[PDB]
Paper text:
Glucuronoyl esterases from carbohydrate esterase family 15 (CE15) have been proposed as an aid in reducing this recalcitrance by cleaving ester bonds found between lignin and glucuronoxylan. Only PvCE15 proved amenable to crystallization, and its structure was solved both as an apo protein and in complex with GlcA and GalA, respectively. PvCE15 has an α-/β-hydrolase fold like previously determined CE15 structures, consisting of a three-layer sandwich with a solvent-exposed cleft comprising the active site. The catalytic triad (Asp353-His406-Ser264) and oxyanion-stabilizing arginine (Arg265, oxyanion hole), whose positions and roles have been established in previous work on CE15 GEs, are conserved in PvCE15.
A notable distinction from previously determined CE15 members is the presence of an arginine residue in PvCE15 found at the edge of the binding cleft whose side chain, found projecting away from the pocket in the native structure, is rotated inward with its guanidinium positioning the glucuronate O2. Conserved are also the highly conserved residues supporting glucuronate binding within CE15, such as the tryptophan, glutamate, and lysine residues found interacting with the glucuronate O2, O2 and O3, and O4 hydroxyls, respectively (Trp355, Glu302, and Lys268). We considered the possibility that these enzymes might bind GlcA and GalA in distinct ways which could then facilitate action upon backbone residues.
Residue numbers in the entry:
A (entry chain B): 27 to 161, 172 to 425
B (entry chain A): 26 to 160, 172 to 426
The structure:
Amino acid sequence: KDYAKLANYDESKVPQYTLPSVLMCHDGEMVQTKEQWEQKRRPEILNLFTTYMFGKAPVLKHKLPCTVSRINEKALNGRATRKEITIQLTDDPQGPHIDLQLYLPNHVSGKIPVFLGISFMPNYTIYDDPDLSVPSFRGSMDKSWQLDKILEHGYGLATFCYNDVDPDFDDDFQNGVHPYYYEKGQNFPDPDQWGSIAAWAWGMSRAMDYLETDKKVDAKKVAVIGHSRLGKTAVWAGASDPRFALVISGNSGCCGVAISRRCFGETVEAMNVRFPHWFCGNYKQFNDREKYLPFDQHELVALIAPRPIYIASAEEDNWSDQKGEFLGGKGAEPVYALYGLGGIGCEEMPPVDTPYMNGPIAYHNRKGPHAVLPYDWEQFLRFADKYFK
Amino acid sequence: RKDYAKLANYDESKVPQYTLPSVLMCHDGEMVQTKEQWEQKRRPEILNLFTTYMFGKAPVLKHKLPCTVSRINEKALNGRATRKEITIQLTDDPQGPHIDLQLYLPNHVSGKIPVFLGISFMPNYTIYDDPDLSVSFRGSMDKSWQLDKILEHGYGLATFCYNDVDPDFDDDFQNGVHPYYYEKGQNFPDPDQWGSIAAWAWGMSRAMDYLETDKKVDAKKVAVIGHSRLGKTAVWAGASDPRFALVISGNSGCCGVAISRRCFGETVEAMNVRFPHWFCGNYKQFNDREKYLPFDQHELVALIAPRPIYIASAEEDNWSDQKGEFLGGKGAEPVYALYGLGGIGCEEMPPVDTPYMNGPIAYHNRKGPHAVLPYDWEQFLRFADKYFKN
Ligand SMILES: O=C(O)[C@H]1O[C@H](O)[C@H](O)[C@@H](O)[C@@H]1O
Ligand SMILES: O=C(O)[C@H]1O[C@H](O)[C@H](O)[C@@H](O)[C@@H]1O
Ligand SMILES: [Cl-]
Ligand SMILES: [Cl-]
Ligand SMILES: [Cl-]
Ligand SMILES: [Cl-]
Ligand SMILES: [Cl-]
Ligand SMILES: [Cl-]
Ligand SMILES: [Cl-]
């Protein structure tokens, strides 16, 4: 079945919908204080997303082993320190691990704020760093990481390849991390248990377990960032792991920050049928049934509150539903207001190349294609400066 | 809306290879060898799976609902029967939905009386051509209920129309009992809460709550029976309410007793797309994903063990998957064995008009159309006699 021919790109044809009320508890009590949000409502909304969309991840009692496998304090011609960190994902030392690559700027005062990116490609793609070689070449993804801009801001960048945690293909979860956490008599995750995206976002929490033990890293200023499917991951990492200080959604779109009820471009059915491994088994009940979601994506952004989040759209990325991305941001504003924080700063989706970033929810829709571009990183750094300086 | 009946496989050679989820294997890998392990560990796991992922949780009451005996005719059918109408209030609202239960008990019978509790497609007047009732038309469904045959066996019949509990149409659960059991911040069942079949089945449990207070009824000898969507319902009533002594599945088929993984005739997707109100939210995840079901329908029959179940198929009803219905029964035999009970008594699906009812699981596949006919009732009463008499 082709989902591209079924996509609506006509704003006039978007159906009627009502967002589920972010401030009304299941039992009817209206949240009017941050105390009511923190102690009652937020727990209900986290449980819905964990059970019905992303799936439960293993809850570890103790950290998994990490070893620093190589440091170069003089990387990039002395400008940076590069560390390679191996992060076990199981209590078997021959089981899957993350190869974490961390760049810290040399000669800045104070602990270093770090962007924890998750990447489509191996760590050697992040920068033409001559101390690395490639057995899809060295520095190939420089453009979507902008290491030089990050260093110039006094910030670090830690990345790993998501294929370390779970290969991005539908194999009935017999590769990657999943089979290590099955019970005896279990060949498959329960309907409420992690798919690929929850595994990747859990990966980012194992990366954070390392980063908070790093002397030069400010563990209170670790941002999470990803593009597209790794944008959906970064928002879930941010929502599920409140240690992260700032969330960057790069074109996260459908089942990221975009309102599902709009059914614009990609839909829940297009997503779950083309990528059956991404979300938990339970999520497949919402195929063609966005009406019956017990949440929408504005409540996922609400889980970030009061921490900042940057929503980035691309003007050509109609599949992502740029307007629905903005509206996922807008729908979270009532929760930020509990903390006496303002909103995006406008009522209508703003024009192209016009960032709003003076509130705790930042948004821009930029010219050109589905990507992370230098222009995006310009805006993310400017936003991050407001919190990290 | 795709015409699924056009697209369905009814060719036995094209049934996919599949493995049935093991009924005896607990989630943690422990195998059941004893009835004690079944009752204490495994049965509860399976019941929770079906309640969470297929039918949905129903309200649990702290007290029996209000009811009144509205009418009593101790001289019904020219003195052959006592007829009572019992109005059962399903909610806190007395202007809300009620079960209007009709109970026929044979006169001239001494003991407490065994009772078939049926759920019907149509109102009480359709059950029998009873001359003291008024308007399809009076006794239009007589052939599906055979009250004369039930009374002849010294058994009684209790029925109510399923529309009484929840209307059978997709109105987003804003009518029937559903909206009365919403929290103040809720406009729709949670994904793990009852759809229509679980409400209908809960309706039968409220009927049983009245029946057990009626001094003429033998509360230990109440059979549940339904046909097609009400067969699905009767099997769930029997699995979820252990008070029922005997379960009759009339052509219950897909998401009834038939094996889902055969993907033969009706499929999970055809079911949930055409009848989105029937099963809970969660069950929609299994649309075209039968291999990912954490169970199959042999485990639902297993929830009746050790109590008897009659599985009835029709020769023309290929939509229901008659061999799948046979194999659901076959698949539960390992659980009945823990109780030292036989199986159906044949290994492969028997030919038409060939009943097997010497085990705790009975089966026939009768000639003719999707229905309940006098033939079926003849077999059902012969089976009931084995348990309700000596
Ligand atoms: O990860 C990506 O690049 C994108 O892949 C597909 O286009 C998918 O439908 C999108 O949801 C996703 O954002
Ligand atoms: O209730 C009935 O008569 C039947 O109606 C339809 O055929 C439905 O698809 C069947 O599953 C059901 O058993
Ligand atoms: Cl809606
Ligand atoms: Cl888990
Ligand atoms: Cl490991
Ligand atoms: Cl799944
Ligand atoms: Cl009927
Ligand atoms: Cl009648
Ligand atoms: Cl026996």
